[PDB]
RNA sequence: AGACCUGAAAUCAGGCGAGGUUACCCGCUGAACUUAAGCAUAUUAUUAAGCGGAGGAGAAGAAAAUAACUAUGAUUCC
RNA sequence: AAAGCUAAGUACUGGCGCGAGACCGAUAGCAAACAAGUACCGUGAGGGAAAGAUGAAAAGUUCUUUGGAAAGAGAGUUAAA
RNA sequence: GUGGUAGUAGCAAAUAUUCAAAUGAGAACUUUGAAGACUGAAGUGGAGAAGGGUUCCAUGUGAACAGCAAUUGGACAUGGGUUAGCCGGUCCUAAGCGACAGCUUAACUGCGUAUACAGUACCUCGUUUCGCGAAAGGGAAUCGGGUUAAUAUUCCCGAGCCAGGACGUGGAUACUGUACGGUAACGUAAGUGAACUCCUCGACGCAGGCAGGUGCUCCGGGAAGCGUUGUC
RNA sequence: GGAAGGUGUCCGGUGCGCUCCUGACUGCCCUUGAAAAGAGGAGGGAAAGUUGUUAUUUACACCCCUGGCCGUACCA
RNA sequence: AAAUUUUCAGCAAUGGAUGUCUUGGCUCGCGCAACGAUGAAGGACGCAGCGAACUGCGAAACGCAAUGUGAAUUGCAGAAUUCAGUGAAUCAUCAGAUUUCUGAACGCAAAUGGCACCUUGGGGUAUUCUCCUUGGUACGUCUGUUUCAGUGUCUUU
């Protein structure tokens, strides 16, 4: 019996359930076409039963290209279409 | 092998992150860095990408 | 690496002023296109490689 | 050697020629990196690619000044120039609309004005 | 032939919606461990998880109100 | 009553920017004082570390000598190796 | 974090190594020769897929790793390497799966074949809804020799073929209207055919023997080189 | 010689042989053994063409032009 | 009596406790209101003279313009000019620009830089051909516009 429960059966497994998702990781179920973490759905998949899961992937963990510049921008009341003056 | 161009580039990138850190970097001021932490051996530890 | 085989033919014609027979093209592991470009039998390559300084 | 105030003199024909001139010199530096050189040469790449980025800035700066000169005080300004701010800030009503009252509430506001009154010692 | 009524089309002209964040806020939906020295009503709890929607605050708000007094007088909070 | 608007006092483990402390002092305090939600494990949902301290100044031990080299031994830097 | 156990258990499957010289600080273990063995074409051989991801190739080397060793290495370091009209993906549809119209549900979801989806101007036709789903199904066309440290039906030399679109010279055919021949089966250098319709190929099971063919294996003569030779 | 130049590459057999392929048969089934893209044929006779710049031939023969994108190392 | 075992001390080894530090945590208080179809958060791939990561940035790529400060940066290299200056800087500030491929993600798709059509400007027997090149084409919904359909209700030419 060599298809086995352990060592023999571990020889058989050379599939891929999951490949990289474009949005999320390696959750993208290829048959099912959906992601374990990111979730085809417009809304991003996230749950209050895991607070560490939210912690990993929220605002600020990434680059924040638009957002980082915001505090400075709002400090000056969003001034537009002007320059600094030469003295 | 019969890969897509996307998967080729992910592989491609992780060759380029698998080299020893420059010698001159440790010499520079206020650095505690010693040998690269993230180095990987292709047998020992695996990508899936 | 985004470039086309018909663009390389015309870009090489614009830069070095030399007409191309046959472009072949290949994406290195890096993520860089290498283009092998055989020139037409009219021209010579060792004239052009000295003009650029790939020599 | 380029400075950006000097390029604000030069014409829309001239800027293009200079941009092209730098890109030749940037290309002939890449050749020397590949074949054979010293570190005396390979610092000159840093000067010139900042030179290129100046000439793109100044060109695009003049492109927008002529547009804003032309569409000044006019409706239907192109989307390219159109005052970003926030999404929420863009939405809302003008101070005039929020401020504006009915003909009824005008009369109650007008005829009962704010009076400076005081209490005696 | 011409007035309406109803329903379509368009890469028509100009606009608006979607998704993200969780501390507080609004609405639905909705448990069990647990306590009762058992347990079923009860309790945990009109809570957690789930699904929607906001704002610098939100909701509430000028009585189809309290009272039975010599009467009080939107709402919120202490 | 079966239609509607309305600031203030009030709430605020998030964001943004300040000020404190009879608090903890690297097995503590956040999981994280360091390239920490990192390395790494899991097909996946998820799981998730260890790791602070030369000296005031690198002045981080040239030079002779043994050895294949690593090192050792003399000598040397420093207030001290 | 560190002991005793302890320099102990143990390193014993897959028949097997030996001699010399070279290299090196150092050779039971690297390379080259000479012998001797094993694998024994449903191979431990030559090529692909899944999975891996630079392990490939060259030069170099102080550690550690390769349960002895190591001058060796899939280890370490610095460089280099993957060339296509014809090889595949791409195109088609299978089992199935996403969405349209709508229909459910507070939504999350779940269902989803319902619908008004050619001859500037003038007509006359009009029933199917978009897409995904095969690197073993279907399907346009490629073969020989050479070449590099590492690529080849992809590079080079030579000989072709296919899809799309076409100028030109010289031939066929017709000009009161699309070629002829054969009794026929059908034929030849060519030999117009819109709308609409029908048909063919694409297009298909398993077992059995029989006949023919490719490649392999085999026997004999001829011409080259090679081996054996105290004996034939 | 210290890479230049030569000859030869010929003519026959054999088989229940082994391999894969084709061909026509025979049998088996309460099992009868995919679809679509695409290529072509036919029926039909719509159009054009009046002895010359015509018009059908773009696979009649020859001639001419273009062929994008991604995989391609190596183990197995 | 050696040797061995055990015990006590000295020196050495092994190990990282104790002590002293601390650009980090934690808690309380006080202010402020500012993401997104003008493409957000998050993801992928790139960019430095000599960089793997972490920070920064997007083919203008550890940055460009402007303003302020006024001479550095630094591990090495180079640049020296930039030195009574229309100007050094891994400087501060930030009002002007860039902002690849993505993602609500929007032409159809998707383990594919796959497969279309329209459109601007140019490049090679052609109005239908191929090529490069610019920008488009998702869904819902409001106001207006244009073109329609209905033996819906009406007159009637």
PDB file of C-alpha atoms (C1' of nucleotides) in Angstrom, chain I residues 63-135:
ATOM      1  C1'   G I  63      13.722  62.724  -8.055  1.00  0.00           C
ATOM      2  C1'   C I  64      12.140  67.958 -11.383  1.00  0.00           C
ATOM      3  C1'   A I  65      10.074  73.384 -10.691  1.00  0.00           C
ATOM      4  C1'   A I  66       9.087  77.218  -7.043  1.00  0.00           C
ATOM      5  C1'   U I  67      10.087  79.533  -2.213  1.00  0.00           C
ATOM      6  C1'   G I  68      13.264  79.916   2.391  1.00  0.00           C
ATOM      7  C1'   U I  69      17.957  79.062   4.631  1.00  0.00           C
ATOM      8  C1'   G I  70      23.053  80.277   2.638  1.00  0.00           C
ATOM      9  C1'   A I  71      27.949  76.134   1.932  1.00  0.00           C
ATOM     10  C1'   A I  72      27.915  71.267   1.870  1.00  0.00           C
ATOM     11  C1'   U I  73      27.267  65.639   0.966  1.00  0.00           C
ATOM     12  C1'   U I  74      30.306  61.518   2.659  1.00  0.00           C
ATOM     13  C1'   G I  75      31.484  54.422   3.088  1.00  0.00           C
ATOM     14  C1'   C I  76      34.425  55.395  -1.445  1.00  0.00           C
ATOM     15  C1'   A I  77      34.391  57.667  -5.933  1.00  0.00           C
ATOM     16  C1'   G I  78      33.954  61.726  -8.651  1.00  0.00           C
ATOM     17  C1'   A I  79      31.803  66.931  -9.435  1.00  0.00           C
ATOM     18  C1'   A I  80      35.730  70.464  -7.720  1.00  0.00           C
ATOM     19  C1'   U I  81      32.606  76.463  -8.888  1.00  0.00           C
ATOM     20  C1'   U I  82      28.476  75.727  -6.722  1.00  0.00           C
ATOM     21  C1'   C I  83      32.003  79.826  -3.700  1.00  0.00           C
ATOM     22  C1'   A I  84      30.683  88.912  -2.003  1.00  0.00           C
ATOM     23  C1'   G I  85      26.533  83.581  -5.521  1.00  0.00           C
ATOM     24  C1'   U I  86      20.396  84.556  -9.954  1.00  0.00           C
ATOM     25  C1'   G I  87      23.559  79.431  -5.310  1.00  0.00           C
ATOM     26  C1'   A I  88      26.234  73.610  -2.084  1.00  0.00           C
ATOM     27  C1'   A I  89      22.550  70.308   0.664  1.00  0.00           C
ATOM     28  C1'   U I  90      20.121  62.106   1.820  1.00  0.00           C
ATOM     29  C1'   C I  91      18.555  70.495   4.113  1.00  0.00           C
ATOM     30  C1'   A I  92      13.774  72.841   5.284  1.00  0.00           C
ATOM     31  C1'   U I  93       9.308  74.335   2.931  1.00  0.00           C
ATOM     32  C1'   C I  94       5.973  72.847  -0.991  1.00  0.00           C
ATOM     33  C1'   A I  95       1.146  76.610  -3.636  1.00  0.00           C
ATOM     34  C1'   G I  96       3.798  74.212 -10.027  1.00  0.00           C
ATOM     35  C1'   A I  97       4.662  69.456 -12.969  1.00  0.00           C
ATOM     36  C1'   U I  98       5.590  64.137 -13.841  1.00  0.00           C
ATOM     37  C1'   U I  99       2.907  60.173 -11.960  1.00  0.00           C
ATOM     38  C1'   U I 100       4.562  52.732 -15.885  1.00  0.00           C
ATOM     39  C1'   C I 101       1.172  48.083 -15.185  1.00  0.00           C
ATOM     40  C1'   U I 102      -2.863  47.574 -11.921  1.00  0.00           C
ATOM     41  C1'   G I 103      -6.907  47.954  -8.361  1.00  0.00           C
ATOM     42  C1'   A I 104     -14.220  50.348  -7.134  1.00  0.00           C
ATOM     43  C1'   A I 105     -11.399  49.380 -12.311  1.00  0.00           C
ATOM     44  C1'   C I 106     -14.494  50.843 -16.848  1.00  0.00           C
ATOM     45  C1'   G I 107     -13.881  47.793 -24.864  1.00  0.00           C
ATOM     46  C1'   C I 108     -14.159  42.078 -24.114  1.00  0.00           C
ATOM     47  C1'   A I 109     -10.971  39.200 -21.102  1.00  0.00           C
ATOM     48  C1'   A I 110      -7.302  36.887 -17.911  1.00  0.00           C
ATOM     49  C1'   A I 111      -2.183  31.414 -14.460  1.00  0.00           C
ATOM     50  C1'   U I 112      -2.952  35.203 -21.791  1.00  0.00           C
ATOM     51  C1'   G I 113       1.252  42.384 -22.062  1.00  0.00           C
ATOM     52  C1'   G I 114      -4.325  37.586 -25.174  1.00  0.00           C
ATOM     53  C1'   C I 115      -8.679  39.089 -28.581  1.00  0.00           C
ATOM     54  C1'   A I 116     -11.639  43.321 -30.963  1.00  0.00           C
ATOM     55  C1'   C I 117     -13.858  47.795 -33.023  1.00  0.00           C
ATOM     56  C1'   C I 118     -13.992  53.305 -33.652  1.00  0.00           C
ATOM     57  C1'   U I 119     -10.682  57.645 -33.872  1.00  0.00           C
ATOM     58  C1'   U I 120      -6.353  61.631 -34.521  1.00  0.00           C
ATOM     59  C1'   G I 121      -1.729  62.465 -37.085  1.00  0.00           C
ATOM     60  C1'   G I 122       1.929  60.412 -40.317  1.00  0.00           C
ATOM     61  C1'   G I 123       4.454  56.165 -43.102  1.00  0.00           C
ATOM     62  C1'   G I 124       4.524  52.898 -47.242  1.00  0.00           C
ATOM     63  C1'   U I 125      -0.676  49.261 -57.219  1.00  0.00           C
ATOM     64  C1'   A I 126      -5.800  51.123 -53.343  1.00  0.00           C
ATOM     65  C1'   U I 127     -12.412  53.911 -51.499  1.00  0.00           C
ATOM     66  C1'   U I 128     -12.033  48.699 -49.215  1.00  0.00           C
ATOM     67  C1'   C I 129      -4.699  46.950 -47.575  1.00  0.00           C
ATOM     68  C1'   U I 130      -1.131  46.304 -44.013  1.00  0.00           C
ATOM     69  C1'   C I 131       2.030  49.498 -40.506  1.00  0.00           C
ATOM     70  C1'   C I 132       3.442  52.950 -36.767  1.00  0.00           C
ATOM     71  C1'   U I 133       0.903  56.780 -33.951  1.00  0.00           C
ATOM     72  C1'   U I 134      -3.041  60.052 -30.601  1.00  0.00           C
ATOM     73  C1'   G I 135      -7.269  59.394 -27.766  1.00  0.00           C
TER      74        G I 135
END
